[PDB]
Write a protein that binds this ligand. Structure first.
Ligand SMILES: Oc1cccc2cnccc12
Length: 113
């Protein structure tokens, strides 16, 4: 029970804060299938921050869970695909940790709406 425009402004700010935590920009764009040919073998729904931005602007995120679930896919896909001893796996752990605090604060703000 809130107005659409302030909520989308909040999601835009939140997405920018999450992208800031991905300092290597390894999640900024879809995983390039041309360089990872086996990626889709067990990754059923790829996700990335650019796709999240397009979903946001297409009005596909109307509650915080819609938005947070796609963020969680970025993390979980990366933990699934990559071995634990890789920078990519550890980057997803770091993003989960640093991004979780960003998400908790942003969800508090949405609940004031
Ligand atoms: O090759 C990649 C490039 C950027 C991100 C990736 C996330 N998981 C597996 C592979 C990736």
């Amino acid at each position: 029970e809130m107005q659409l425009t302030p909520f989308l402004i909040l999601l835009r700010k939140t997405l920018e804060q999450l992208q800031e935590k991905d300092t290597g920009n390894i999640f900024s764009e879809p995983v390039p299938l041309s360089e990872v040919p086996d990626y889709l073998d067990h990754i059923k729904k790829p996700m990335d921050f650019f796709t999240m931005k397009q979903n946001l602007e297409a009005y596909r995120y109307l509650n915080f869970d819609d938005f947070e679930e796609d963020f969680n896919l970025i993390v979980s896909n990366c933990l699934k695909y990559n071995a634990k001893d890789t920078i990519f796996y550890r980057a997803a752990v770091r993003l989960r940790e640093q991004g979780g605090a960003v998400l908790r604060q942003a969800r508090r703000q949405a609940e004031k709406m």
